[PDB]
Design a protein around this ligand. Structure first.
Ligand code: 4OF
Length: 127
């Protein structure tokens, strides 16, 4: 049971912007989560072949990971901050959907999400 192609990270015909909020999402939100001791399972698409999880992409239809988010931010892929915030939230929700409560991977996601929520609470107002 195979891996799908990764999420899109470049699209020239997609309208996009650089805003102070999106800069914050990269320089603060992404960075802070990326350096966390629990970040590594989330830093790239799940290789569900290597992990022997043949059902993974049969259940998780909208996968998202921080490697993809990082690329999108570095590529100025997004139109607004909420588009990027949705990607983070999809990543967390997918984790809680696929896994059992209390699993180590869920604890890792919860630690990242707690930080994510704190940084989003301090999202600067649009300039
Ligand atoms: C018996 N045995 C048990 C574990 C094993 C297993 C079970 C469930 C997942 N589910 C998952 N869900 C979401 C993600 C994420 F991408 F959102 F982060 C994700 N990533 C990811 C990446 C690398 C590793 Cl090595 C891991 N392993 S791990 O056990 O979870 C960890 C990090 C060492 C605690 C996880 N993995 C992955 C698995 F391997 C199956 C067979």
């Amino acid at each position: 049971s195979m891996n799908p192609p990764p999420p899109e990270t470049s699209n020239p015909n997609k309208p996009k912007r650089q805003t102070n909020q999106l800069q914050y999402l990269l320089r603060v939100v992404l960075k802070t989560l990326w350096k966390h001791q629990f970040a590594w399972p989330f830093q790239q698409p799940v290789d569900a072949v290597k992990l022997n999880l043949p059902d993974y992409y049969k259940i998780i239809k909208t996968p998202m990971d921080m490697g993809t988010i990082k690329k999108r931010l570095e590529n100025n892929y997004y139109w607004n901050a909420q588009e990027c915030i949705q990607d983070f939230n999809t990543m967390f929700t997918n984790c809680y959907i696929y896994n059992k409560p209390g699993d180590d991977i869920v604890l890792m996601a919860e630690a990242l999400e707690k930080l994510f929520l704190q940084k989003i609470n301090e999202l600067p107002t649009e300039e």
